[PDB]
PDB file of N, CA and C in Angstrom:
ATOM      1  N   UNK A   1     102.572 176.502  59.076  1.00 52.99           N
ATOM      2  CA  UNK A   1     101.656 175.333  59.193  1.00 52.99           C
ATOM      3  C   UNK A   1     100.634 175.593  60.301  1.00 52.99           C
ATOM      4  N   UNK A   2     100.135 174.722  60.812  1.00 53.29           N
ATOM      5  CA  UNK A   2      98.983 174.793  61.732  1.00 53.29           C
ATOM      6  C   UNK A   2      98.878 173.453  62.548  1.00 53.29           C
ATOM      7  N   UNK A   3      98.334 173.417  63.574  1.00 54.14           N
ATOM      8  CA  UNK A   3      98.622 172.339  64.696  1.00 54.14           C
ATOM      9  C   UNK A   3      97.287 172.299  65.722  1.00 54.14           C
ATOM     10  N   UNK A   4      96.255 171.768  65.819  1.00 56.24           N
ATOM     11  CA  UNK A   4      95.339 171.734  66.365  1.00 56.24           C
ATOM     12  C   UNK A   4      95.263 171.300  68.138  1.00 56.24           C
ATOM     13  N   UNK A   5      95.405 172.327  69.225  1.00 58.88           N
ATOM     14  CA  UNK A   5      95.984 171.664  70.865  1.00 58.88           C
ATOM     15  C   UNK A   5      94.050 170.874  70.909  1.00 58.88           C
ATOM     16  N   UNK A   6      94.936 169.697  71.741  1.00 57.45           N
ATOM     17  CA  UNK A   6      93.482 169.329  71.537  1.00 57.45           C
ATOM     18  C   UNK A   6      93.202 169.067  73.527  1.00 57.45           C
ATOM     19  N   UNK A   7      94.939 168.995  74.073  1.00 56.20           N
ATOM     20  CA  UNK A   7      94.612 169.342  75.361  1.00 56.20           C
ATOM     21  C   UNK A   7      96.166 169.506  76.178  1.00 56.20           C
ATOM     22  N   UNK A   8      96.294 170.430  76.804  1.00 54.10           N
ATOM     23  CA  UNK A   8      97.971 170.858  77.280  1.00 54.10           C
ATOM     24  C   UNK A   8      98.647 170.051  77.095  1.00 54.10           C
ATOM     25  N   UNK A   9      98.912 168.784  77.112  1.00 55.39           N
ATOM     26  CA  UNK A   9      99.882 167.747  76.639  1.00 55.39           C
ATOM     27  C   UNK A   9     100.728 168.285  75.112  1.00 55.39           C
ATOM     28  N   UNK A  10      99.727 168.744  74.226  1.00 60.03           N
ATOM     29  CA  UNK A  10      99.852 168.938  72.404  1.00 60.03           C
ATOM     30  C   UNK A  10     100.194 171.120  72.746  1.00 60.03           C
ATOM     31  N   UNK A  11      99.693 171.207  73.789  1.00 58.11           N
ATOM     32  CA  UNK A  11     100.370 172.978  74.033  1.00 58.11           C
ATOM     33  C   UNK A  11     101.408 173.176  74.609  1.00 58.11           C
ATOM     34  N   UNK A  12     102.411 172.245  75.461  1.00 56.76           N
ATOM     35  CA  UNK A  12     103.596 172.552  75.572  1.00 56.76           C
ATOM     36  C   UNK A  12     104.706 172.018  74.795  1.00 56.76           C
ATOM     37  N   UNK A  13     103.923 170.836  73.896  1.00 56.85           N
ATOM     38  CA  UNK A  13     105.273 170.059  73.159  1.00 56.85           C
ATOM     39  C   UNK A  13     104.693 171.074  71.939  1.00 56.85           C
ATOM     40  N   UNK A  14     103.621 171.747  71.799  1.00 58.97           N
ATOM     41  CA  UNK A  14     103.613 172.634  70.082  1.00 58.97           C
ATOM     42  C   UNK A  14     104.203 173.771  70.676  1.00 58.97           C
ATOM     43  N   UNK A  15     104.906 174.608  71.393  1.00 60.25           N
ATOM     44  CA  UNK A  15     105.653 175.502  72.055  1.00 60.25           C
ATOM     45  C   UNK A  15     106.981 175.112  71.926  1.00 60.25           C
ATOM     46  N   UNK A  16     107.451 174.211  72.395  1.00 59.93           N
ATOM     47  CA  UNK A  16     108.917 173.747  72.465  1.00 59.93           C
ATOM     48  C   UNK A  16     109.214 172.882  70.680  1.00 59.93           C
ATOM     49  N   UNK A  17     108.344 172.323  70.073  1.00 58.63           N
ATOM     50  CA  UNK A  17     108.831 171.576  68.878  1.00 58.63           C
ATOM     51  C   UNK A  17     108.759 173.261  67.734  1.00 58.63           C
ATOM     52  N   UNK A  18     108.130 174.425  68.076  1.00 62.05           N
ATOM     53  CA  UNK A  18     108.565 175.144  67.188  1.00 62.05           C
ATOM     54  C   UNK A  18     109.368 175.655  67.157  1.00 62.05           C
ATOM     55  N   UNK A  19     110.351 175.553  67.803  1.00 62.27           N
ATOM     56  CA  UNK A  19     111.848 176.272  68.262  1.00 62.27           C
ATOM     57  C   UNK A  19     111.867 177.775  68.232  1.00 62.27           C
ATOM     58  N   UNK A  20     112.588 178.318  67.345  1.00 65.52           N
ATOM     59  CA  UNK A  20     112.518 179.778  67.655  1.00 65.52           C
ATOM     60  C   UNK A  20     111.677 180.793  66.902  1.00 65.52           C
ATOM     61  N   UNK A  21     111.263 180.114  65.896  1.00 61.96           N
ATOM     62  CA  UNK A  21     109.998 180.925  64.955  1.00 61.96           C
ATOM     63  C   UNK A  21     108.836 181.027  65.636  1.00 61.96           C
ATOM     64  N   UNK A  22     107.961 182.272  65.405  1.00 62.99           N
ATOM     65  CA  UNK A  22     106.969 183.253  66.180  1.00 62.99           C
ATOM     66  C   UNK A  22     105.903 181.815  66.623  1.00 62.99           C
ATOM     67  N   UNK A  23     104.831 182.176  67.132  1.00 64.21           N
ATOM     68  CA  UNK A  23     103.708 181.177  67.567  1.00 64.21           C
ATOM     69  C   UNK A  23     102.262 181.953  67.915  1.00 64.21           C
ATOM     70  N   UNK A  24     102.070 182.367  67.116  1.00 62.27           N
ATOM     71  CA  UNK A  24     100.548 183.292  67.728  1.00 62.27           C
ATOM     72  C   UNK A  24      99.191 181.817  67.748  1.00 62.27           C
ATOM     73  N   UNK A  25      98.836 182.236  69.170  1.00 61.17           N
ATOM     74  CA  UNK A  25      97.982 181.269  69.291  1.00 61.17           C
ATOM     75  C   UNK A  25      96.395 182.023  69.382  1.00 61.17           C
ATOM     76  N   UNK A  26      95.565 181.478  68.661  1.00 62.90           N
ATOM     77  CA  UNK A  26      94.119 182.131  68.754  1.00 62.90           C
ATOM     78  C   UNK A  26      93.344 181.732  69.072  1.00 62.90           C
ATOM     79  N   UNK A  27      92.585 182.039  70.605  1.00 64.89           N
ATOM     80  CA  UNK A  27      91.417 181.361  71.270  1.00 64.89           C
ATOM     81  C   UNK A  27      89.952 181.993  70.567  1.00 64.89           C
ATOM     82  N   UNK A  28      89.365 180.969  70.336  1.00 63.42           N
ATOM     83  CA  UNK A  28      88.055 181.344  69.768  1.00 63.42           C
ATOM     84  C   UNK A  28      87.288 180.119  69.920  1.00 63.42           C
ATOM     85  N   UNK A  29      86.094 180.499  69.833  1.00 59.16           N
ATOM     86  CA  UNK A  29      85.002 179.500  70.104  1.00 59.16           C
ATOM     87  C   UNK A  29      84.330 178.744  68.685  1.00 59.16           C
ATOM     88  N   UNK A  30      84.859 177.822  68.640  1.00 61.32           N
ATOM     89  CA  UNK A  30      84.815 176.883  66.812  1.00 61.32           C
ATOM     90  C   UNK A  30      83.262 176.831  67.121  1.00 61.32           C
ATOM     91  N   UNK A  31      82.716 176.990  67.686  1.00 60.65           N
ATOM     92  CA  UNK A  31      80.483 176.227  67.904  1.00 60.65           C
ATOM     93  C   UNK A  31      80.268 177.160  67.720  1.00 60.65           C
ATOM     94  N   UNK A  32      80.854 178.630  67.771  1.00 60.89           N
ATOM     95  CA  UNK A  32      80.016 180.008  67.572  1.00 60.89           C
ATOM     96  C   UNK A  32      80.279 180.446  66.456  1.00 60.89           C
ATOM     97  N   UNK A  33      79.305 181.119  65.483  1.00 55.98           N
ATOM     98  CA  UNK A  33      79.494 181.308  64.397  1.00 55.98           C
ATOM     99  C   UNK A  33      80.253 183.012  64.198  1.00 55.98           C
ATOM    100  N   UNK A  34      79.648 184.112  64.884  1.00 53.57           N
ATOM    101  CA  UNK A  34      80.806 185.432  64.463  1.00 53.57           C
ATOM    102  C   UNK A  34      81.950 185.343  65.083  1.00 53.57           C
ATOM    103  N   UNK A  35      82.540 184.488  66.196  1.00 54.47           N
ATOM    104  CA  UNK A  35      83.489 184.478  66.373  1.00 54.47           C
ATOM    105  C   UNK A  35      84.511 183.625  65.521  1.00 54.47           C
ATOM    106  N   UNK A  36      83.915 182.201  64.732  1.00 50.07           N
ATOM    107  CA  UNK A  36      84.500 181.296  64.059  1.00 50.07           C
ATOM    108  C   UNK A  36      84.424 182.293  62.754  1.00 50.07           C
ATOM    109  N   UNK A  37      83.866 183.252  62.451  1.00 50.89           N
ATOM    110  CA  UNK A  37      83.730 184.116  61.123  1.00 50.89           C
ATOM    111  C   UNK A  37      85.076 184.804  60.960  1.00 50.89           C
ATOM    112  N   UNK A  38      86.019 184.857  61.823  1.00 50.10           N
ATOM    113  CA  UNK A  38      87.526 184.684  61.519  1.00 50.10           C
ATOM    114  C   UNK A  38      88.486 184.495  61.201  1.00 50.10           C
ATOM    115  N   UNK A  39      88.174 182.876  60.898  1.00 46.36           N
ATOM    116  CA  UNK A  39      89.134 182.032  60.508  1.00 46.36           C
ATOM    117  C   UNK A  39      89.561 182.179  59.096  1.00 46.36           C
ATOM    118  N   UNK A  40      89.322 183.309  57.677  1.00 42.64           N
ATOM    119  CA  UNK A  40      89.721 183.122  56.555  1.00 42.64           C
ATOM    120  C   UNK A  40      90.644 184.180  56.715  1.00 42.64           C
ATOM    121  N   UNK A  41      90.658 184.650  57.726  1.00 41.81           N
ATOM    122  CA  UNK A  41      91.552 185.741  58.063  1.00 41.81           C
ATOM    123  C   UNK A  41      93.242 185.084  58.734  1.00 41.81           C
ATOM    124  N   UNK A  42      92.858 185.158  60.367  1.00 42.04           N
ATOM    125  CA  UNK A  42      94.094 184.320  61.121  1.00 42.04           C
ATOM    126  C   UNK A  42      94.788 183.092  60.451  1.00 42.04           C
ATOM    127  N   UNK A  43      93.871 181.563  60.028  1.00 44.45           N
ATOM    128  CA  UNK A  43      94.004 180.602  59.957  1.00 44.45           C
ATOM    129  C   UNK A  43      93.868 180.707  58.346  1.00 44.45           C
ATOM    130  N   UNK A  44      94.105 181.876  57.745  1.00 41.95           N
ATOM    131  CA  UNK A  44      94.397 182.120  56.201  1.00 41.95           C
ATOM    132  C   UNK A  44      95.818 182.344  56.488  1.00 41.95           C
ATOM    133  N   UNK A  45      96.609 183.120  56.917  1.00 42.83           N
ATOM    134  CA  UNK A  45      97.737 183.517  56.660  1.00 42.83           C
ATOM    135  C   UNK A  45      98.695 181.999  56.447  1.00 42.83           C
ATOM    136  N   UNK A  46      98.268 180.799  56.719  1.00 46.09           N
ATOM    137  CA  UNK A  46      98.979 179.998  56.345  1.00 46.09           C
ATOM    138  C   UNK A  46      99.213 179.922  54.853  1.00 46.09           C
ATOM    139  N   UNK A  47      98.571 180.461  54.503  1.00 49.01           N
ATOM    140  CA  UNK A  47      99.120 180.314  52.723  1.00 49.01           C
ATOM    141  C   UNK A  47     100.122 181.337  52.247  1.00 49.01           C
ATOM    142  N   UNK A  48      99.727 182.795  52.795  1.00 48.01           N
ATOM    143  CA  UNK A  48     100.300 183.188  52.821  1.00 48.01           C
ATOM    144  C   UNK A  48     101.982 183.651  53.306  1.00 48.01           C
ATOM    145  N   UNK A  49     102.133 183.174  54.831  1.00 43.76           N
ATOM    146  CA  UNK A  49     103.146 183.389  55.296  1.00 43.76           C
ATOM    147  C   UNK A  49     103.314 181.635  55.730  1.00 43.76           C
ATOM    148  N   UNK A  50     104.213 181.358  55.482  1.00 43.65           N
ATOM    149  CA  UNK A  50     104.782 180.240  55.451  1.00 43.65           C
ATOM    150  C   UNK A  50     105.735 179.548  56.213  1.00 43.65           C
ATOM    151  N   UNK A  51     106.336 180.864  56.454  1.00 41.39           N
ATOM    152  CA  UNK A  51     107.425 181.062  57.693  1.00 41.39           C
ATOM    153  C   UNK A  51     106.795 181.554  59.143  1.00 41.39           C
ATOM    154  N   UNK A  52     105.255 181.163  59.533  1.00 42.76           N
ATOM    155  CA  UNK A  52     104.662 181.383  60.529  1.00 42.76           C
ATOM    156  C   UNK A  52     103.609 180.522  61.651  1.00 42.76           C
ATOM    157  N   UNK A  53     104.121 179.869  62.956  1.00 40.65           N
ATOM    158  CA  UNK A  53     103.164 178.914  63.411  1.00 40.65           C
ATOM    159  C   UNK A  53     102.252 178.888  63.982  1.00 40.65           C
ATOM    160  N   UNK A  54     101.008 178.898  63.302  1.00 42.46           N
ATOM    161  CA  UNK A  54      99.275 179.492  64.269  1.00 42.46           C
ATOM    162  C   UNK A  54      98.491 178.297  64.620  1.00 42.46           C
ATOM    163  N   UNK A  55      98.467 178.448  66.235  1.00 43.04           N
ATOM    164  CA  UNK A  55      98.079 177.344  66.721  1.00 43.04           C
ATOM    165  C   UNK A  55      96.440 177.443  66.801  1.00 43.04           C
ATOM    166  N   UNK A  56      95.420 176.975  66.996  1.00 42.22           N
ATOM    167  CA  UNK A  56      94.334 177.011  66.924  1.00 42.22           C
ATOM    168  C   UNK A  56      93.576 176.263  67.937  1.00 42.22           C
ATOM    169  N   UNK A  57      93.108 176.835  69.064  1.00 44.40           N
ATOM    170  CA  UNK A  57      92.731 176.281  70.450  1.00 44.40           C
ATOM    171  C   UNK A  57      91.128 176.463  70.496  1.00 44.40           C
ATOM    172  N   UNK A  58      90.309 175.357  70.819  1.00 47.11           N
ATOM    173  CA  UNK A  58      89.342 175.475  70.961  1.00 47.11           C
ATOM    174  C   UNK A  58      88.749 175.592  72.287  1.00 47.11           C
ATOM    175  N   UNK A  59      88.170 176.750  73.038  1.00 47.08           N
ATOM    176  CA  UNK A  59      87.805 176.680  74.116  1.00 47.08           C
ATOM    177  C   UNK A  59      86.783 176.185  74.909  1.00 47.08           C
ATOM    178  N   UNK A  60      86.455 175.155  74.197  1.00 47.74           N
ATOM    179  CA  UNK A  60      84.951 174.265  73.872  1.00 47.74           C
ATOM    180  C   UNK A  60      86.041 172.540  74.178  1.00 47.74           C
ATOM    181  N   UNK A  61      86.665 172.310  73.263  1.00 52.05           N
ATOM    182  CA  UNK A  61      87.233 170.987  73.283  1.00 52.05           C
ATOM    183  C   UNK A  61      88.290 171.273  74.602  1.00 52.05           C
ATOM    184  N   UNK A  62      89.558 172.334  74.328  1.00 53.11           N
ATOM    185  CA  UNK A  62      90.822 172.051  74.822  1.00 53.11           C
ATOM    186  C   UNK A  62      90.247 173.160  76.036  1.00 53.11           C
ATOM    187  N   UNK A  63      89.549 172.848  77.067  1.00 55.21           N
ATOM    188  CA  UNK A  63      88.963 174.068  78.250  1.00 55.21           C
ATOM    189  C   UNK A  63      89.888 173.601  79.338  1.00 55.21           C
ATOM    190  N   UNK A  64      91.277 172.880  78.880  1.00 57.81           N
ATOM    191  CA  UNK A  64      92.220 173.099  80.121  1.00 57.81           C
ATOM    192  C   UNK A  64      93.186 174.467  79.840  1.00 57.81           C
ATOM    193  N   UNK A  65      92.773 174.298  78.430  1.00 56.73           N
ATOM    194  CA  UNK A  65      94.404 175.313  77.885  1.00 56.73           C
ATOM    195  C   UNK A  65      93.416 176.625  78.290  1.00 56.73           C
ATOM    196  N   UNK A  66      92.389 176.546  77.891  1.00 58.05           N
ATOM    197  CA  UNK A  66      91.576 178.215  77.968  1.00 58.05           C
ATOM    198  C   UNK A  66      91.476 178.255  79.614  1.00 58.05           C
ATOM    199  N   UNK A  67      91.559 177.705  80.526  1.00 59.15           N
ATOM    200  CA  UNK A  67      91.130 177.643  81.745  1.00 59.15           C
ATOM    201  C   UNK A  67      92.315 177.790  82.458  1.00 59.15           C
ATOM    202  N   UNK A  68      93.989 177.351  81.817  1.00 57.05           N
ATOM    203  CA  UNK A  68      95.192 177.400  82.592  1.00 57.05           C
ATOM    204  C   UNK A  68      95.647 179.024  81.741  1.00 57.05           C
ATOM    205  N   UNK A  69      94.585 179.401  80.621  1.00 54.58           N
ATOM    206  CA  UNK A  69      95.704 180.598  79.426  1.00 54.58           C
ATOM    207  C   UNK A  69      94.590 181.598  80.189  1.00 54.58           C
ATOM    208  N   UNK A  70      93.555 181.639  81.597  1.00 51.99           N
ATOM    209  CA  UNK A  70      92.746 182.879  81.877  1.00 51.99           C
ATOM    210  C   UNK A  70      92.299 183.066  80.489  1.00 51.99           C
ATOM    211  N   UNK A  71      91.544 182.509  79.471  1.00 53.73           N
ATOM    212  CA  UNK A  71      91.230 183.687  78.155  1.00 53.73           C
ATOM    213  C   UNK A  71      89.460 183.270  79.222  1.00 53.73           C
ATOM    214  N   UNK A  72      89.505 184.476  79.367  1.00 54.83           N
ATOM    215  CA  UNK A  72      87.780 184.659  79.521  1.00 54.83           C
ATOM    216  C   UNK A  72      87.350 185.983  78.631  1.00 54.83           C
ATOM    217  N   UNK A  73      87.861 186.318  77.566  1.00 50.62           N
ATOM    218  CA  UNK A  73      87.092 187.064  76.345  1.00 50.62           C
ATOM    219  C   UNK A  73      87.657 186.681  75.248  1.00 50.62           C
ATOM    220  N   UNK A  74      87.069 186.124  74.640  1.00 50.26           N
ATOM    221  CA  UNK A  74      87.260 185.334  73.353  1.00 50.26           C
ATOM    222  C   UNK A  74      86.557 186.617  72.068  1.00 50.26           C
ATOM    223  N   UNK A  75      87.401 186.505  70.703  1.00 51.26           N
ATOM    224  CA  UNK A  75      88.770 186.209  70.588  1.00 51.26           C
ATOM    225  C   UNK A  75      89.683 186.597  70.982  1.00 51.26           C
ATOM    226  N   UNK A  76      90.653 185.901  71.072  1.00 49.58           N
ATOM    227  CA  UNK A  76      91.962 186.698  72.082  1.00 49.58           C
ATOM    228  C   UNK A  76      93.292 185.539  71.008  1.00 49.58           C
ATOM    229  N   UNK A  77      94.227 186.901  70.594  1.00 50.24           N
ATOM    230  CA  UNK A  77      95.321 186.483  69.940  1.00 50.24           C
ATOM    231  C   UNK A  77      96.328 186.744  71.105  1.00 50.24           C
ATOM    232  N   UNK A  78      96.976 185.513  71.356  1.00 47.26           N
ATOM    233  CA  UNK A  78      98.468 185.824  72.064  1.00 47.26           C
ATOM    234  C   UNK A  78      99.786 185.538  71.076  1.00 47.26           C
ATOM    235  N   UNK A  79     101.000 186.314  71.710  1.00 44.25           N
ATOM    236  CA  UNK A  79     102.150 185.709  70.855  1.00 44.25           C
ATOM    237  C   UNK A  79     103.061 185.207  71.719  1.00 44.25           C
ATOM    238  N   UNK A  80     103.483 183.985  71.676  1.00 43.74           N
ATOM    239  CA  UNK A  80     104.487 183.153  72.341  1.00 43.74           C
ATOM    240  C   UNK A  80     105.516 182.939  71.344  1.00 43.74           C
ATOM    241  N   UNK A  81     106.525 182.846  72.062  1.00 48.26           N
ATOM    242  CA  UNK A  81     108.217 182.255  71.275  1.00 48.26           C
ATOM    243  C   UNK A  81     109.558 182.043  72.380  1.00 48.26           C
ATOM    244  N   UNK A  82     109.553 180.844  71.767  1.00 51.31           N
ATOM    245  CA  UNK A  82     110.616 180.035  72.611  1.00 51.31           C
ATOM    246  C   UNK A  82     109.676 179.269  73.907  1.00 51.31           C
ATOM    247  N   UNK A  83     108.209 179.527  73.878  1.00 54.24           N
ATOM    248  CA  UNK A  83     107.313 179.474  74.996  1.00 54.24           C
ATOM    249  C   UNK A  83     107.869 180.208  75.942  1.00 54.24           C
ATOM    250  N   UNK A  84     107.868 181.793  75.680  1.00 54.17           N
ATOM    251  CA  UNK A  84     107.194 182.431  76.168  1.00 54.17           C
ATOM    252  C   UNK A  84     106.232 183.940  75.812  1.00 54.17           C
ATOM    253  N   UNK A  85     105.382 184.082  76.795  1.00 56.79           N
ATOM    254  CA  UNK A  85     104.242 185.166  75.988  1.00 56.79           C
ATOM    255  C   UNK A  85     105.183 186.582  75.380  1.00 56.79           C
ATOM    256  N   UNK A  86     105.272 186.580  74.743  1.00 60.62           N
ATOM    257  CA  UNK A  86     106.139 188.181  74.246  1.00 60.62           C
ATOM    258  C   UNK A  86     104.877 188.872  73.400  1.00 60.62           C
ATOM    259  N   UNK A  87     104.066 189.076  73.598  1.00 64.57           N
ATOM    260  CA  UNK A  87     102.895 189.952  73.332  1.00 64.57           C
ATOM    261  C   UNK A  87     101.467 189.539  72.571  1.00 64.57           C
ATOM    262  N   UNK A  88     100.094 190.217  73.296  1.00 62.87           N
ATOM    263  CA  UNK A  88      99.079 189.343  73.309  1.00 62.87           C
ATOM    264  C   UNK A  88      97.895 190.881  73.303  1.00 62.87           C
ATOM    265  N   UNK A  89      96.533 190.515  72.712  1.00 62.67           N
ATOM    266  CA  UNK A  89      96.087 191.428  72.404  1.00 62.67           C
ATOM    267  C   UNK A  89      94.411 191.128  71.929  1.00 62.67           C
ATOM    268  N   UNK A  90      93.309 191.118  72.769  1.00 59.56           N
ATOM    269  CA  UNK A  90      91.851 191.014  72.686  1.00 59.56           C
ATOM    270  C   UNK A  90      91.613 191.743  71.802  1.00 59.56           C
ATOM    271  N   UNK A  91      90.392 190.958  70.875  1.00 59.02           N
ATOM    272  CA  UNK A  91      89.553 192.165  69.938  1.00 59.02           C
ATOM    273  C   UNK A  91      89.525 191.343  68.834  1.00 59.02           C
ATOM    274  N   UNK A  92      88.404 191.978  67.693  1.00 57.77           N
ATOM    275  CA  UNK A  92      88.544 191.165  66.484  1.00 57.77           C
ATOM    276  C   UNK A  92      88.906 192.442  65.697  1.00 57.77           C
ATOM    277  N   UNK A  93      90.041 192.595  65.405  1.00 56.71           N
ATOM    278  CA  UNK A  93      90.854 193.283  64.689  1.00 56.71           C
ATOM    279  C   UNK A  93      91.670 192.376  64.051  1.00 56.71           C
ATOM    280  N   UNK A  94      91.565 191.681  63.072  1.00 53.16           N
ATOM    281  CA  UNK A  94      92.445 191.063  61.835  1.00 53.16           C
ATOM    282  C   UNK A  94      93.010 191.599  61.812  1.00 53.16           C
ATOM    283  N   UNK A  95      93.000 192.941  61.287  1.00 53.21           N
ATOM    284  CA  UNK A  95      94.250 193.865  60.480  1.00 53.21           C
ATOM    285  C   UNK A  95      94.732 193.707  61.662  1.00 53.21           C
ATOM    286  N   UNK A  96      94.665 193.883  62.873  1.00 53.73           N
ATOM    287  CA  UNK A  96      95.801 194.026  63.881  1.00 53.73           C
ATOM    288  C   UNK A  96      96.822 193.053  63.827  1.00 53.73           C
ATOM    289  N   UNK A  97      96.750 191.722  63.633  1.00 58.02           N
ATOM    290  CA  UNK A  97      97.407 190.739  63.353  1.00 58.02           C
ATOM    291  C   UNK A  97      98.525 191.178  62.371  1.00 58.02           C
ATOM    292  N   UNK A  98      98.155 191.385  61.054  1.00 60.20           N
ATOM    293  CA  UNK A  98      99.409 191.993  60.720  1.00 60.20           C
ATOM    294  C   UNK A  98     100.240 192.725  61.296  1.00 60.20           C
ATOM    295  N   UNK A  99     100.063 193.416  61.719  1.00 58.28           N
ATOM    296  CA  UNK A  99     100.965 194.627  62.773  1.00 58.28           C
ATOM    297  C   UNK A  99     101.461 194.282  63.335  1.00 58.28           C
ATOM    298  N   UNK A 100     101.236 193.378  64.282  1.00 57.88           N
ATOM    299  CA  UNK A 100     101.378 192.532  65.424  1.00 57.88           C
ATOM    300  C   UNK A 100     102.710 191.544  65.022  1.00 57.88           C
ATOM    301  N   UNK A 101     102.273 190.694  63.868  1.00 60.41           N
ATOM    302  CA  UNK A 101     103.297 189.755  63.440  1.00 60.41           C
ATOM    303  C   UNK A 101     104.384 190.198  62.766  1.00 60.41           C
ATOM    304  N   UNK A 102     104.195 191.327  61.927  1.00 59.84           N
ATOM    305  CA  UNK A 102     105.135 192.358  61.706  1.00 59.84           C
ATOM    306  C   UNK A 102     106.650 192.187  62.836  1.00 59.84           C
ATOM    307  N   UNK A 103     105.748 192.555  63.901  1.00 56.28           N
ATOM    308  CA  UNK A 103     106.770 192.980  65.078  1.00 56.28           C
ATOM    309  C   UNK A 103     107.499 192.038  65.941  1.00 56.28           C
ATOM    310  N   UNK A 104     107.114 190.740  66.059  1.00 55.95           N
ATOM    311  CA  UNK A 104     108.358 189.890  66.190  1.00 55.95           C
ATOM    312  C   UNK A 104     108.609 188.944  65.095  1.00 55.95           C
ATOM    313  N   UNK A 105     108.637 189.492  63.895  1.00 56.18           N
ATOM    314  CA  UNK A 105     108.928 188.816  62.700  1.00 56.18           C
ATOM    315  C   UNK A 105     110.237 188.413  62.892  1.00 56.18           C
TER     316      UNK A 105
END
């Protein structure tokens, strides 16, 4: 599914209400257009993987979470579980995402 933080209040209870299944969270800038040129990719795999929770942070609306998460290069995929970071990785490499989720599948 998918869960929109709209400000740290909705990023530590969407951390703890997903219990032990993966959490890749993706900072990107929704007002910019090649960075929002992403989203049929990351914020696609919901159809596909089903058994996976991608949170979607806007660093424009939610600039406590981008301002307490250091992302000062956008896009930036992290992976959290159980809330905590277990591996995180700058760049617009989609395909990397697979790989990535692969590995704490």
């Amino acid at each position: 599914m998918v869960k929109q933080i709209e400000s740290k209040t909705a990023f530590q209870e969407a951390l703890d209400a997903a219990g032990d299944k993966l959490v890749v969270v993706d900072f990107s800038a929704t007002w910019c257009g090649p960075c929002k040129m992403i989203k049929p990719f990351f914020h696609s795999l919901s159809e596909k993987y089903s058994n996976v929770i991608f949170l979607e942070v806007d660093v424009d609306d939610a600039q406590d979470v981008a301002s307490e998460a250091e992302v000062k290069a956008t896009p930036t995929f992290q992976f959290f579980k159980k809330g905590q970071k277990v591996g995180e990785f700058s760049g617009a490499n989609k395909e990397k995402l697979e790989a990535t989720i692969n590995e704490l599948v």
